């Protein structure tokens, strides 16, 4: 019903410029000042922007001459021009309409930004397959490394979201290549092993599509 | 530029336990504080509006109080799916400034972690890299120890860990430890093993795996 979209995100280089939007449903633009709040990866919260119904604009120091707010209320987007953009500017951005004294807060789902001059590289999915040491009637663990890809993120599902229960996706962890690592591991009854079909897909940023199968080793 | 002292960072308390979560502002800012929960890969959601009020929908659980300086943020009763991160943000004076943000870990009995070591794939051998995974499945605490021994030898500086959140239905951790090292240092030695310490293990646990 009521929600705030944002886009335009993505991974550009140092310098580089950026068109955030915000669109709102539900909530009109030009009646709210919208907010423009910003996350860094594993961070807090840093006020960025904000538009007043009015159009009056204030920016935070750290983007001032740099960051633009703006909203088009025919429509009804909000808008961030993001240019001469640093290394420190890659974060999780949202837009809130946080109403002043009453009730209707409405934050965006975020739009991720990147800033880097590292350029896009697909993973390397490898298996980890289950111990031949695994007895039958116990939990058996199997898996796929998902190594040597940036920028984040990647998306792992198993069976194409037939399996879900006992799936743990760990957080990338960035290895000290510059490139993101990671592994998404399931557990499964050691009976059904090579009588049930485990396949693990992983997409990514660049073109990278890997529906790739766990068997046992030989 | 006021500055919001958010504290504590961390806490931990069992179901239905009493939480308070306090913030002092650097300046009078009179009941302009709002409240904000963010659970993990979600967006922050505004709680507590206006130092006191609740937004739209929120349990009766959570509270807000205070005026001036000092605020606080407190949980009746902890439900599991009260797992976030809890940030307190003044919203009149400009900028808009947040608190450091306070973790709260839901309590349960302890688990202890179901280890499993994992060789590094063929396919791999070729891209010239090893890579030696252990897996630690649900547990709690977060606190644990992995350690890698290859050739009974203690390796470090060649391993990162990955910890995934609390879960909704469990409550409890997931570790992964990964070894990654070059093709040459793999085939030059034989015995692969990671060593796990944990609370609710009587006594270090050690999987292992030789070539072949």
């Known amino acids: 019903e009521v929600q705030l979209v944002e886009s335009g995100g993505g991974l550009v280089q140092p310098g580089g410029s950026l068109r955030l939007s915000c669109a709102a449903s539900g909530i009109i633009v030009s009646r709210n000042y919208m907010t423009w709040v910003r996350q860094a990866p594993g961070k807090g919260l840093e006020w960025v922007s904000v538009?007043?119904?009015?159009?009056?604009?204030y920016y935070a120091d750290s983007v001032k001459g740099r960051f633009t707010t703006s909203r088009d209320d025919s429509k009804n987007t909000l808008y961030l021009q993001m240019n001469s953009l640093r290394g420190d500017d890659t974060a999780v951005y949202y837009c809130?309409?946080?109403?002043?004294?009453?009730?209707?807060?409405?934050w965006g789902q975020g739009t991720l930004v990147t800033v880097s001059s590292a350029s896009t590289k697909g993973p390397s999915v490898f298996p980890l397959a289950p111990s031949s040491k695994s007895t039958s009637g116990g939990t058996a663990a199997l898996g796929c490394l998902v190594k040597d890809y940036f920028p984040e993120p990647v998306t792992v599902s198993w069976n194409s979201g037939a399996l879900t229960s006992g799936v743990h996706t760990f957080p990338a962890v960035l290895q000290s290549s510059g490139l993101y690592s990671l592994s998404s591991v399931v557990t499964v009854p050691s009976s059904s092993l090579g009588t049930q079909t485990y396949i693990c897909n992983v997409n990514h940023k660049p073109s990278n599509t890997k529906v790739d199968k766990k068997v046992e080793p030989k | 530029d006021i500055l919001m002292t958010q504290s504590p960072s961390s806490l931990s308390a069992s179901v239905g336990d009493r939480v308070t979560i306090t913030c002092q502002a650097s300046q009078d800012i009179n009941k302009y504080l709002n409240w904000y929960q963010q659970k993990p890969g979600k967006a922050p959601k505004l709680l507590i509006y206006?130092?006191?009020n609740l937004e739209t929908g929120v349990p009766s659980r959570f509270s807000g109080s205070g005026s001036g300086t000092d605020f606080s943020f407190t949980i009746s009763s902890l439900q599991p799916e009260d797992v976030a991160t809890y940030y307190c943000?003044?919203?009149?004076?400009?900028?808009?400034?947040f608190g450091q943000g306070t973790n709260v870990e839901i309590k349960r009995t302890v688990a202890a972690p179901s280890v499993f070591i994992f060789p590094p794939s063929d396919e791999q051998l070729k891209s010239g890299t090893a890579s030696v995974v252990c897996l630690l499945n649900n547990f709690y605490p977060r606190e644990a120890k992995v350690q890698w021994k290859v050739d009974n030898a203690l390796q470090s500086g060649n391993s990162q860990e990955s910890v995934t959140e609390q879960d909704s239905k469990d409550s409890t951790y997931s570790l992964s430890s990964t070894l990654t090292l070059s093709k040459a240092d793999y085939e030059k030695h034989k015995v692969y093993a990671c060593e796990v310490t944990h609370q609710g293990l009587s006594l270090p646990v050690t999987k292992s795996f030789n070539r072949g």
């Open positions: 943000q003044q919203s009149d004076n400009l900028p808009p400034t």
């Open positions: 206006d130092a006191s």
């Open positions: 809130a309409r946080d109403p002043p004294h009453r009730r209707g807060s409405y």
């Open positions: 538009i007043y119904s009015g159009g009056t604009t």
